[PDB]
Amino acid sequence: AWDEWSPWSLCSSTCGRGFRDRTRTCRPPQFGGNPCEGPEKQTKFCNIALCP
């Protein structure tokens, strides 16, 4: 089982296309659990302003 996501980062670009990301680690293993392979990162597109 997965632990909670971290907050999203800010957009890596202050204008134009960039990335934002967040990460999570595994919860401690339990008897019978499906093994979790950690850490995991989620990345998405962002664009916060048009560049000059």
Ligand X SMILES: *[C@@H]1O[C@@H](C)[C@@H](O)[C@@H](O[C@@H]2O[C@H](CO)[C@@H](O)[C@H](O)[C@H]2O)[C@@H]1O
Ligand Y SMILES: *[C@H]1O[C@H](CO)[C@@H](O)[C@H](O)[C@@H]1O
Binding site for ligand Y (CB under 6 A): 4-5, 7-8, 22, 24
Distances (CA, A) of 47 to 11, 18, 20, 41, 43: 7, 6, 9, 19, 13
Does position 48 bind ligand X by CB under 6 A? no
Question: How far is residue 22's CA from residue 41's CA, in Å, rounded to a whole number?
Answer: 6
Choosing from 1, 5, 10, 14, the residue that interacts with ligand X (CB under 6 A) is 14
Nearer of residues 37 and 52 to ligand Y, judged by Cβ: 37
Determine, following the binding rule CB under 6 A, whether residue 16 of this chain makes contact with ligand X.
yes
